[PDB]
Amino acid sequence: THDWLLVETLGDEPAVVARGRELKKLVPITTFLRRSPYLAAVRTAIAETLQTGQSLTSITPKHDRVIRTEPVIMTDGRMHGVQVWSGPTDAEPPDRPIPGPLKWDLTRGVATDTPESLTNSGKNPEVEITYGRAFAEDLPARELNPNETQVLAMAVKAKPGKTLCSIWDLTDWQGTPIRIGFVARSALEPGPNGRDHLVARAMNWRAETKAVDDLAQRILIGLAQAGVHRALVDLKTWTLLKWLDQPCSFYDWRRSAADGPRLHPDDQHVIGSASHVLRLPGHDVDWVPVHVTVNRIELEPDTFAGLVALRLPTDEELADAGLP
Amino acid sequence: HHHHHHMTHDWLLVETLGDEPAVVARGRELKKLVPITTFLRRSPYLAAVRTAIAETLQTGQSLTSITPKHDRVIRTEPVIMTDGRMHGVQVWSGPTDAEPPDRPIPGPLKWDLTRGVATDTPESLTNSGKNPEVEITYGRAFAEDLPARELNPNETQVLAMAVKAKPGKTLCSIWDLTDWQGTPIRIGFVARSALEPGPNGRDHLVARAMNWRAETKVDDLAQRILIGLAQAGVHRALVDLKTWTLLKWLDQPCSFYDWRRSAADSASHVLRLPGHDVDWVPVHVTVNRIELEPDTFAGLVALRLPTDEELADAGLPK
Structure with a gap:
């Protein structure tokens, strides 16, 4: 229980998606920590982190434990998740796996990544553009991954509610085989013209090598x-x-x-x-x-x-x- | 006193083309060619089952052995290909007060990789959902045996065996198919490639197999x-x-x-x-x-x- 827990907080109940770097399938914190004496306090730490947008250090004197939380905040200011660690007071937490928030605007057809999400997926952040990305810049070329069908499905026929947790195989820019975990969730968000956008919000992280x-x-x-x-x-x-x-x-x-135009406006009519x-x-x-x-x-x-x-x-x- | 059922109670399908008889099905459940001495390790009746399998292989006949002194009944059924070759033996054993369940019917078939021609049986055709009144058992193209359109695990290896045949390879799998009327079925099979005498002085590469209808899942x-x-x-x-x-x-x-x-x-x-x-x-x-x-x-x-x-x-x- 010494590992950092990555908790996705876009649902009704906060749900674990990573213990350290090992993937967990959006397990509600009350299920994941059903048999935990720190459950109540952990829920409070996360709830406050959502409130304040801040890194917190919470103490429970009764059990001589400290709870530490790290917000995962997308560059539009939106909280995608919280990373949590608990343990004895004077104990030092392990190295923290860096989570990488990103989003796909399905209405625009445009992705917004972060240096963190790009680094995790093995790309060179010094030479990458974070905004205005095609979906095809976030998915590998040629190589296929588990449940990629559901990702594409998520994108073309947008329906809120759909969530996805997976581990994917990639290759970084140096040519090295790597793996990532990620969680993704689609929902309707208010747009500019009073028309709501469908948006998938996600977090990735670099997973352990198992391939x-x-x-x-x-x-x-x-x-x-x-x-x-x-x-x-x-x-x-x-x-x-x-x-x-x-x-x-x-x-x-x-x-x-x-x-700009995706195609010539005169060819719009053109588009077994x-x-x-x-x-x-x-x-x-x-x-x-x-x-x-x-x-x-x-x-x-x-x-x-x-x-x-x-x-x-x-x-x-x-x-x-x-x-x- | 219901005596204890044996570990063979569901019928074991034993593939007999390797060095030692190896279990490939318990009932309809797939097993990965587990040597009979491993599968029935510590069974008091292991020696008697091995003997029963050997006797079936030699006589080519169904056998029933009843031994009151050991409160034991053993039943074997040969799985014989239409060329007289034994592909396997199905065995049941139990105390005298036990009754064997329905025996899952295995379907032997072979692919002559040198000729590119398959020989099936009504049993293998029926198990894989083909219509045995319209199918011809001999002279078959491999494409008549592999499902159309539907893909299955390790089918790549089956295809590789056809185009670049090698002896000494085995494959055990459960495949999802549809029968000729559109009904989903599943089959298990084991296959083993080997060299056999050929008609014109040169060995042929031949894969011998058995299938069975698997549990719906x-x-x-x-x-x-x-x-x-x-x-x-x-x-x-x-x-x-x-x-x-x-x-x-x-x-x-x-x-x-x-x-x-x-x-x-x-x-x-x-x-x-x-x-x-x-x-x-x-x-x-x-x-x-x-x-x-x-x-x-x-x-x-x-x-x-x-x-x-x-x-x-x-x-x-x-």
């Missing part, structure tokens, strides 16, 4: 094609969700994730497979013609996403599209 | 994507690239040519494949290489009718 059978993934990899870049997209909004191959440099998908040439935002010019091939993927019953294959259009293809 | 993004890539009129399959043997259907099988044909009897092209009513039929084929294991490849083929233009392009007459 397969996937015929479909081997087949999918075999379908890769030079010059062609596959991705999952939100059909309704053209929000980019995930790269299945490496990202394409044909167009500026990163800048246009949060800023379907194929067409679409003008997407350029790096140096306004518009770049890209040949797009689209299939509907069913993630959950009545929940669909777009499988898009992107490549440069031929001179011939440009002509048929009515483009010079 | 997924996370796969790639599978969902693969399914979304299905196209009307297009039928996808995995093939052995070396021999063009059909290994597995990823969509429902197609009718416009005789894919079941044995040799007895990204890249694209119109290929002539065996016909039903005629000798050859033109088929448009798109092929991708799939890596199943390191240095172990199969082909993914997309099969569809060719267009008149594609026919002319291929220099093929109508």
